[PDB]
Design a protein around this ligand. Sequence first.
Ligand code: N6F
Ligand code: N6F
Lengths: 304, 304
Amino acid sequence: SGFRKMAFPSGKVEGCMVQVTCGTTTLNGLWLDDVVYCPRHVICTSEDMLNPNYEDLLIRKSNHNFLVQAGNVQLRVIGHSMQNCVLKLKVDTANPKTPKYKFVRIQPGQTFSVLACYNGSPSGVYQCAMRPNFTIKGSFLNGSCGSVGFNIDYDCVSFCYMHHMELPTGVHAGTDLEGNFYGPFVDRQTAQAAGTDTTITVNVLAWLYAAVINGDRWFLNRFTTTLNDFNLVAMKYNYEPLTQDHVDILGPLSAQTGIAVLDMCASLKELLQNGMNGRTILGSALLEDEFTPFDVVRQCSGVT
Amino acid sequence: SGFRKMAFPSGKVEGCMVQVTCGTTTLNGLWLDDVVYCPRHVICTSEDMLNPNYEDLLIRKSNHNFLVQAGNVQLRVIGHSMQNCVLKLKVDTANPKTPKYKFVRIQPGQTFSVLACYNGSPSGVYQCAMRPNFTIKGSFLNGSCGSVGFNIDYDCVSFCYMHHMELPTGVHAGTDLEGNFYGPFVDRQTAQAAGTDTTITVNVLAWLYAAVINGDRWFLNRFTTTLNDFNLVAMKYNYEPLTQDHVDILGPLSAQTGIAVLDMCASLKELLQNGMNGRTILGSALLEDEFTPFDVVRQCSGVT
Ligand SMILES: CC(=O)Nc1ccncc1NC(=O)[C@@H](C)c1cccc(Cl)c1
Ligand SMILES: CC(=O)Nc1ccncc1NC(=O)[C@@H](C)c1cccc(Cl)c1
């Protein structure tokens, strides 16, 4: 028992982190096979970030200008290319620690672990959710760019995020491993505001099921609701509309606890309308939305 | 910017996890050099756990009864001994992945990362605090025993916790790596209640400093207090009394923000007396106490 914001074990990803330096700029790269992936803004100075022409900037750069270091050993760069907002540096040595991996573009509301890194060295690991507005609420400082987000399926690492930018709001923006930003963000030092961030209803419901499984039952009531009635409440509280696909994914949790999804929706509706009244659920005084139904089942079943 | 419950990268510890089986019981072991450390209750059946005589139980066990597996390879057991509540299994092979390590007995209020494991395989990593009542609020299921807690200082892993037991309360109890339980707990299936759990005042203060550093300043007020006046409030709200040692440790955070420790104590006093009024601090609707002043400085400076 007990429920925690749990991250995947980070070892397979630690073995891939390298330091990439170009001119005066140093950030992190991801070494998989004979390719190092890093944010393309490594070729920029803070002066260039105001309005960078990455094609023209990359033209003044050769293989020897990209310094890649894996711990204390230098990798020889034999090729460089730009794919969307990432640079791909071909090195002459395949990473001997390359795990079985995939590149995946996650959907908003899905979760992933982040291995924060500085100068190619891992500092920490935490669990994140891709917000419905395509930002992440991470913990990143200057030098953290190139830190990756991932999921693990037994022995396979699915890389889904590469950190690129911190908005003036203090929220984070980045790309998939093909260099496509999540959301409308561009890799430019300009005012970019994150749109309205809604609460991931299906995740809050999954977390309510985790609370019931782990003993916290005070919020359960004698009521039920319909998808349309619940969604009228969800709109008012900036919660994502619940669909039958969401109800379907909550099926295993509903079967485990014996509580119908719409009954759990009525508990959530009353929690939205009346608050927690000073009470807590799984040690939290607010409705947690960064656990997917898959995360709840995984943690409550012990998937390694 | 951004503040998260961050765990240490787990790779060095993943390379040490093994599966230990004795009779019908399977749990996790920690392989360092030519020794495997695991909870001694591995020699018990659930029938034995009611009132186990570990000395008599261990007498009916030989080196060949302890099956140690590191992934898919079997380790040859050449010795076995009981040290307090842990068994030490001498194997004929030193772990090639043994990191630089230490065994440390942490103090209540200190934090550490847990690598939850099942059948010698890592499932996840999360940050914990040793509660003032010597329990931890973790996430552990049947099979998780032997999962360890640790801290990392550059390249050295300081192992501080080994998971042994879940109390009927749903909180967790375990030992240091010499087999000494934290708290009054015994490795027996008997009613053991965790004493009163207080809030780690110095950690809440450090987290208030992290909030100020990261932009959340609404709670700052025009007031100050004294250690004795603040402690009268701390007693009423089951908060650990603040000492000058605590004020001293908060020094770097006070210097960074320019806010005197006693001024931050007055903000905390008003937060205790009036609550958050529906507001949040670092995404939390309650006062967080599982970040030490060292964790705040580390996360806010990017120590790898
Ligand atoms: C100073 C500082 O803490 N930065 C950071 C902190 C946390 N994450 C990233 C960063 N870095 C950035 O956001 C910068 C270099 C930037 C600016 C404009 C566009 C892009 Cl793609 C990147
Ligand atoms: C069933 C189940 O989820 N267990 C567990 C869940 C989470 N942690 C540990 C455990 N295991 C225990 O607490 C058990 C085996 C036990 C009982 C009495 C004394 C000790 Cl030292 C140990």
